[PDB]
Design a protein around this nucleic acid. Structure first.
Lengths: 289, 121, 133, 237, 226, 109, 54
RNA sequence: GCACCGCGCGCAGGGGGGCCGGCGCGGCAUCUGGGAAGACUCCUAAGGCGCAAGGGAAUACCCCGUGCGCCGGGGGUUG
């Protein structure tokens, strides 16, 4: 409740990094008498390898490893709740193939591969789920693909243009996330933030916000605020424009960090709405949301 | 259904139909189910593209057996009318089979395209 | 510790290390009905004649490695003893079939694999008519 | 002239310009899929000079995965006449007949094939040879033929699925003996068609090794096939 | 560039295709009276935007890109109404949009005509796109395969009774089509009708005069009389 | 064209049979070990003209059969280009004798 | 690390190696870590690093 | 083994290192060259191409104006 006490540090070895972190929290189970068993929360990570690691916070070391024959995993996420005991991780990677791992009953194993891109030069850099069965992935070849997890099919390939600010024509969608009403918010290599329609999968807005590329996004739990953190050490806050629906605009920006803002995540509960942004200056900055 | 190496990505479908149109201008193409079956049986065929919009789908299902016996890659595009006017036919073509030769930029495109089909499989 | 073993012919039970009892069968076309009855987990006469004791449940245990068969025979009220699923029970149901040469002088002093072959042919041709030709 | 090879149950036929592999036909006077066969007698019949007793079916390595391993330098095949082999992926009864002729009448080969047309030809082959039993079931579901398959000695595995090591893993946890044998044929263009095949094969060997096999050897099938490996390994010993 | 544009029929707006292809084309929409940017409509394709057309009430616009994706994009909600696909088009070249008494929420134009690079021009009744949901695979009212080269021009009559579509790359490749019957007129053009290599066509405001201008630089005029 | 197609089918069957016979006549193998000790023990255990003539003969037969199949395949391709050059309408395919490649972009109506 | 393989000329004898990662973490691929940086610094150059120093 | 009044040299090879310099394989945001390339673009010109004969030669290469065809330019009023 505003104390921010650092409890445990579990260090990895030499030549070992951590790129993505995902908690998997089960829903509230109920006993025979009306007592509440809360969700057991398991921590998964990737380390710029082909291996998803599950961490044991009780023993303060790594619990499990899983790996399939594919490239290095660059982004992953846990499928949201609509099933109940059958939840699955979806992981994008370098060479393209969206691998899909299974987690149930204390297990982490490489289940299958949904699809892969035709072009071998498509690298998957960010992933976010719109619903239980629709996965929105950003790619390096200027696309935001929207796959469907059950059959593994492809709903639509959203695209973005060249960057006309410098060279290097391929834009890179560094962070996608999904609003609660269905829209998709995506920060990319131009420092833009695009608002994509949820039903049609076309863009509805381009908001030029940053100068260098937007590296991480965060979306409020009720869908009212968007926080964008870029490589120009800049954090920008957007609220919807009054009147027309689906139109966002940048309320204000400020440079909170001293290097780029590589990751941030939000929390809103028990009288505490924060968003914690960690960058490359090792200082996690907590903003009130 | 029975069309399991389906080409659903529109970028890959556009690449397949562009290579079909280039082979059609090179006269390196066999159009139709019977001519496709003849090219696959004779073994001159480098890649074979079937169409999944066939109304009885079972009239092109014999070609996966001969391609499994002869180790050539087959792939399914969505629309037979698109395949037809990709070849330049003004009819609906349900199966097409594009062949190989000694040295071509088209042969390099064929090798890359069957690599992409093997990525689908 | 009642274990439930199903071979192609009959069942065995090793509760007290060493084998305790059995149930034998041979050479009928109701063997494929037994086979389908454990493809689902339905009522089975050999199952019921095995699990029918007269006293009570004396300790609620029946070790069957497939969870589907376990929670389909949980629902039967004929004996109301509740079974257990495969709690990584590899050692039991692997060692009994590797050391099943010890069992063969007990219930069926013979070689019963010809009806195993016949049931395999019957099931495979049943599925080949399920994909009819 | 016919000699037995180093592998028991496998024969070679030698001539002035050729060297062929062959097996001892369990049904003499009968061929299966159009294969050449040689009639040889044991010596002691000079006045008659009729090749009466032994009929040998020529094993074709261009249609067999296992026969491409034996001519490649497979040190052991883990099976002798009288063993028990589970054949995973029995495509229309091509190699499983030669494996049945290897294991003989006191051996038995359990063929598993999910695909229905190859199941049709497999059962129409398997009617004659009684030492095979065919199972038309998905190999990714071993509890559907757990009643039908007893404990085996060797698992042969030629199935074109990307979770080939997982199929081998569940079938070996349910059917292979302690210290058993595994001969698996790995297809790189089936598992990952973009990586180097050495890397694909090394990842599959590592998956078996964490799946509690012991990789003894790996050899490529590359005068006969393209980008195919054969891993010969033992189970728990 | 500013080469390709379309002014709205109400005269208030004007849309310009932005020269940025990269697997999907956008077009910037400009208020006519003040010459300022007011919107932008982006569609996904392979080479961008083949053509587009404003709706008849003047709000939205239908953008037919290359590789067959056609997109109805409204001006009121300022996002995409829907996306459908031309039947079997390996790549679109031109589009036109006309008639009256169409669907009320899709601009009130009845017919859309999309001509591809093979030579085939599909004509769809726009009351068949509504399944606001658009059908992802509508069927054409009529597929015209009379011209053999890529369809370069297409133009509806302003009262929505004629449709003239022509290819530039053949001498005298122009056809004239009745609506709603979708029948090609067979009595004109004849073998000796001096069309030339047709580069632009234009129907009159009362639709009494067809003007055809060729690659030589000669306009010729034809009274339409029914 | 029909005659060249039948001769090409016969010659392709001959090439397949001859290549099968040549392979049957004449970092490949990897053996794994648990440790350097077992590897060195196996290395201790490793420390403990007719075919040339007939294989050169089969190699010369294989090269002549490949030349024959390549010649018949080039003949069949040249005849398909002759069909394209003599079609009743303008069909793409083949080079002119000046060297410029024929490509017509009309559709077959 | 791992002992390098020894080739007789036909076959290759190699020690298996998985003794690097017991329970700790898998070692990050330096080729993939430098690729994500090269997507972050595309054509852009660094500013001069420190103060007055050679 | 050579010098038993000496360093060192000729040679077998066991392991690890400087991972210094090359080679091979793989990815590589861009940049450079080539091919293909959009059909508004180029398509060599008001003509060209093909097939089959005929005639001549630097005799491997080619050139020229008869019979069938395929386009193109120009001209061109609901045939």
């Amino acid at each position: 409740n505003g104390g921010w006490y650092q409890e445990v540090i579990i260090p990895g070895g030499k030549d070992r990094s951590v790129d993505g972190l995902v908690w998997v929290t089960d829903p509230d189970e109920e006993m025979a008498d009306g007592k509440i068993i809360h969700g057991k929360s398991r921590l998964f990570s990737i380390g710029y390898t082909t291996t998803i690691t599950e961490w044991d916070l009780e023993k303060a070391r790594a619990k499990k490893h899983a790996s399939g024959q594919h490239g290095e995993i660059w982004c992953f996420g846990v499928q949201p709740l609509p099933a109940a005991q059958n939840r699955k991780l979806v992981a994008g990677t370098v060479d393209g193939n969206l691998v899909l791992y299974s987690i149930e009953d204390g297990d982490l194993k490489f289940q299958k591969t949904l699809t892969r891109t035709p072009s071998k030069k498509t690298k998957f850099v960010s992933i976010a789920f719109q619903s239980h069965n629709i996965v929105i992935v950003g790619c390096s070849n200027s696309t935001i693909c929207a796959y469907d997890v059950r059959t593994g099919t492809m709903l639509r390939q959203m695209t973005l243009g060249t960057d006309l600010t410098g060279g290097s024509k391929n834009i890179i969608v560094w962070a996608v996330k999904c609003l609660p009403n269905g829209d998709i918010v995506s920060g990319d290599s131009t420092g833009q933030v695009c608002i994509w329609d949820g039903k049609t999968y076309t863009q509805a807005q381009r908001i030029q916000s940053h100068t260098q590329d937007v590296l991480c996004l965060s979306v409020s739990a009720d869908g009212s605020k968007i926080i964008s953190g870029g490589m120009d050490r800049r954090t920008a806050v957007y609220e919807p424009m009054a009147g027309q629906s689906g139109r966002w605009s940048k309320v204000f920006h400020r440079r909170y960090h001293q290097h780029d803002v590589k990751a941030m995540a939000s929390f809103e509960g028990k009288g505490m709405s924060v968003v914690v942004s960690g960058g490359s200056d090792a200082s996690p900055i907590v903003l009130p949301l | 259904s029975a069309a399991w190496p389906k080409a659903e990505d529109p970028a890959l479908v556009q690449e397949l139909l562009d290579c079909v149109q280039q082979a059609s201008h090179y006269r390196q193409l066999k159009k139709g189910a019977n001519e496709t079956t003849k090219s696959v049986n004779r073994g001159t065929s480098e890649l074979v593209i079937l169409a999944a919009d066939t109304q009885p789908l079972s009239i092109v299902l014999h070609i996966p057996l001969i391609c499994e016996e002869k180790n050539v890659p087959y792939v399914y595009v969505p629309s037979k009318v698109a395949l037809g006017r990709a070849c330049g036919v003004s009819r609906a073509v349900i199966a097409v089979s594009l062949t190989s030769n000694e040295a071509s930029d088209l042969n390099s495109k064929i090798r890359a395209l069957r690599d992409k089909v093997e990525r689908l499989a | 510790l009642f274990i439930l073993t199903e071979t192609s012919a009959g069942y065995a039970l090793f509760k007290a290390i060493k084998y305790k009892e059995f149930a034998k069968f041979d050479s009928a076309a109701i063997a494929v009905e037994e086979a389908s009855g454990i493809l689902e987990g339905k009522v089975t006469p050999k199952l019921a004649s095995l699990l029918n004791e007269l006293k009570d449940e004396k300790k609620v245990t029946l070790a069957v490695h497939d969870t589907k068969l376990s929670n389909s025979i949980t629902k039967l009220p004929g004996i109301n003893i509740k079974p257990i699923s495969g709690s990584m029970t590899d050692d039991l149901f692997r060692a009994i079939r590797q050391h099943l040469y010890n069992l063969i002088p007990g219930m069926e002093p013979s070689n019963f694999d010809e009806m195993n072959l016949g049931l395999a042919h019957s099931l495979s041709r049943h599925k080949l008519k399920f994909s009819p030709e | 002239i016919v000699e037995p090879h180093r592998h028991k149950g496998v024969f070679v036929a030698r001539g002035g310009k050729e060297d062929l592999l062959c097996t001892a036909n369990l049904v003499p006077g009968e061929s299966v899929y159009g294969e050449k066969r040689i009639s040889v007698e044991t010596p002691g019949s000079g006045p008659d000079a009729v090749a009466t007793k032994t009929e040998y079916r020529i094993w074709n390595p261009f249609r067999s995965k296992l026969a491409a391993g034996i001519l490649g330098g497979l040190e052991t095949i883990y099976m002798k006449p009288g063993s028990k082999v589970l054949y995973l992926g029995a495509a229309s009864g091509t190699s499983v007949s030669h494996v049945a002729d290897i294991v003989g009448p006191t051996g038995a080969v359990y063929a598993v094939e999910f695909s229905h047309r190859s199941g049709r030809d497999l059962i129409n082959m398997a009617t004659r040879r009684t030492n095979v039993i065919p199972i038309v079931e998905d190999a990714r579901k071993p509890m559907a033929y757990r009643m039908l398959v007893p404990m085996v000695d060797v698992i042969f595995a030629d199935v074109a699925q990307p979770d080939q090591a997982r199929i081998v893993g569940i079938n070996a946890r349910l059917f292979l003996k302690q210290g058993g044998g595994l001969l698996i044929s790995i297809k790189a263009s089936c598992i990952d068609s973009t990586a180097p095949p050495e890397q694909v094969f090394a990842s599959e060997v590592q998956k078996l090794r964490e799946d509690k096999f012991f990789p003894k050897e790996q050899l490529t099938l590359e005068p006969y096939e393209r980008d195919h490996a054969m891993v010969s390994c033992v189970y728990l010993q | 560039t500013m080469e390709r544009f379309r002014v709205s029929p109400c005269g208030r707006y004007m849309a310009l295709v932005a020269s940025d292809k990269k697997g999907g084309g956008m077009l910037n929409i400009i208020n006519v009276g003040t010459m300022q940017w007011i919107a932008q409509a982006r569609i996904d394709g392979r080479h961008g935007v083949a053509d587009f057309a404003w709706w008849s009430d003047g709000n939205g616009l239908t953008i037919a890109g290359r590789d067959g994706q056609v997109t109805e994009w409204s001006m009121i909600t300022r996002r995409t109404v829907g996306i459908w696909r031309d039947e079997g088009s390996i790549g679109g070249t031109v589009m036109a949009l006309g008639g009256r008494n169409g669907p009320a929420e899709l601009g009130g134009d009845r017919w859309v005509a999309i001509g591809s690079n093979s030579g085939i021009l599909n004509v769809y009744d726009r009351n068949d796109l509504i399944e606001i949901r658009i059908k992802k695979y509508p069927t054409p009212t009529r597929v015209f395969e009379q011209l053999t080269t890529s369809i370069s021009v297409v133009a509806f009559s302003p009262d929505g009774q004629l449709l003239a579509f022509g290819s530039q790359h053949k001498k005298d490749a122009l056809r004239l089509v009745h609506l709603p019957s979708c029948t090609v007129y067979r009595n004109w053009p004849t073998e000796q009708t001096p069309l030339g290599r047709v580069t632009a066509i234009a129907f009159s405001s009362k639709s009494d005069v067809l003007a055809v201008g060729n690659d030589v630089g000669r306009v010729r005029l034809w009274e339409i009389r029914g | 064209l029909g005659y060249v197609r039948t001769m090409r089918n016969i010659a392709a069957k001959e090439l397949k049979e001859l290549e099968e016979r040549y392979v049957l006549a004449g970092p490949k193998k990897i053996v794994f070990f648990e440790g350097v000790e077992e590897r060195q023990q196996a290395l201790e255990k490793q420390k403990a003209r007719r075919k040339q003539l007939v294989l050169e003969k089969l190699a010369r037969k294989v090269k002549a059969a490949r030349k024959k199949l390549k010649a018949l395949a080039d003949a069949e391709y040249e005849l398909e280009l002759q069909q394209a050059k003599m079609a009743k309408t303008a069909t793409s395919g083949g080079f002119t004798k000046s060297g410029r490649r024929i490509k017509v972009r009309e559709r077959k109506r | 690390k791992n002992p390098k393989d020894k080739r007789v000329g036909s076959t290759a004898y190699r020690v298996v190696s998985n003794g690097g990662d017991p329970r700790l973490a898998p070692k990050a691929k330096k080729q993939s870590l430098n690729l994500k940086q090269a997507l972050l610094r595309r054509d852009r150059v660094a500013k001069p690093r420190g103060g007055f120093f050679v």
